Design a protein around this ligand. Sequence first.
Ligand SMILES: [Ca+2]
Length: 561
Amino acid sequence: NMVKIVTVKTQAYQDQKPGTSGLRKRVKVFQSSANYAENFIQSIISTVEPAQRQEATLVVGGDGRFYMKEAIQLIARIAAANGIGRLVIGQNGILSTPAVSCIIRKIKAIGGIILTASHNPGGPNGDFGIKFNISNGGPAPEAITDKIFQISKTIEEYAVCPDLKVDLGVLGKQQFDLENKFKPFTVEIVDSVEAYATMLRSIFDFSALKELLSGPNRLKIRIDAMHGVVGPYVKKILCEELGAPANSAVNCVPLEDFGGHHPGPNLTYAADLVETMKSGEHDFGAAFDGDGDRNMILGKHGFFVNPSDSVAVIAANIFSIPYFQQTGVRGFARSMPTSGALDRVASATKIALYETPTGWKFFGNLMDASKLSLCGEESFGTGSDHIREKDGLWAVLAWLSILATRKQSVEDILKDHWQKYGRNFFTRYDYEEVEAEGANKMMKDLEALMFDRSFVGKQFSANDKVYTVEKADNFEYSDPVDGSISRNQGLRLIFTDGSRIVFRLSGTAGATIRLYIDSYEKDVAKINQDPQVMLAPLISIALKVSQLQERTGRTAPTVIT
Ligand SMILES: [Ca+2]
């Protein structure tokens, strides 16, 4: 109840970058490395002028990783002794990343510390992360993350309350009286799900989702939370409030280790859900990543809706969703390597399509400027301007509202969408841990070759067709808001039939090659053929023009999705 504020002299580290997605180290780093977490928490609290701390609220929560509660305890001690007026924390420390974004904008907080390492595994031998979100509810941008890192290199003391202890399991206010401070420190413990449910309730028709999900004629759904943070949201919204039967909530109790495996969503990693969905007993499966920003969408028998098709089908039936009826469509966005299925829909409906470089800030900027309603990422990311993060459970409810409106299966919707818009066959090849100089040279040469003036027009034949290069560059994007220029974001081979090949090198232990292949077909004799077969021509073309085997020694990507 009554705590001393004490100051501790510290030794600064040199690698405490927040990055675009939070500071991530092994839990063992955050556990053994002395004051490692205490340092970085101080560094960021030092980003806000001391004059505004009493008036300031941070929301903090996390995805349930091992070491989370201890770290929220830690945020509290530094928050108090530095003059921050209020923390509002998820019950048990539980806050999905969409929920944090929601609460920040709802209570007009100055921002939030999210304890999440997203897909990376949690556990005593796992990873742990600390992300900072600012007052618009979205990720701390570069200028704030630079100041913070600059501070973490110099940090030689932090202010703390060594004996403060928050009870995260009980709801309501906790008031902490700092001895030799006048204004108290107040923590508000809130229900993990309520503010976020209250938001979803406002954008969807829960009445209609309740009709479709209940009764003897309900569609059967299985929602796999991968033992992460969305578990309680599924059970409390999907099962308790719109009345889905209890067994729909698969792996919906958060575990400190996420159940052994890592909370990353794909057809290999959520095979849990996939085996269930192969039954053909359920009409719709979904699976979420660890902090709830990503989603995979499944159909009857495990029909797979690839994320770039997903964002397109949502765009195609967007007014099924009350939120968009009232807002209208301010525009569509998708990362550059995402398939152009969404483009086909934005082109039919004459709505702006922004092709963004991978990363959130480009989506966020467009939302802040009221020109972006629905954004999509090939990497299981789907979001809307209801917040400033991507939102997994939200994508599921959009799909459910569309199923309700449309009264077809997931698969018949995709077939009609393809038949009506043509299909963007799509895959991405991951080459993990390739040798860097080879990787870098491969891009270097393929860039040089693309820049020669004879390259546009160069034809390539395959077992049937000829693709012709319409354009070929390293992707550069001029942000229409903050004015930034982002360059060297990916080699694009644009073919005249609407197909593309794009190469990228990842940034987050060696070098990893991503090769995205977007083969577009409009003929209903090609439309429902096997995707890896129709993608093979462009895959052969891609590998030959990059000489990727010759530069990496690989015959096969690590991972195909
Ligand atoms: Ca995530």
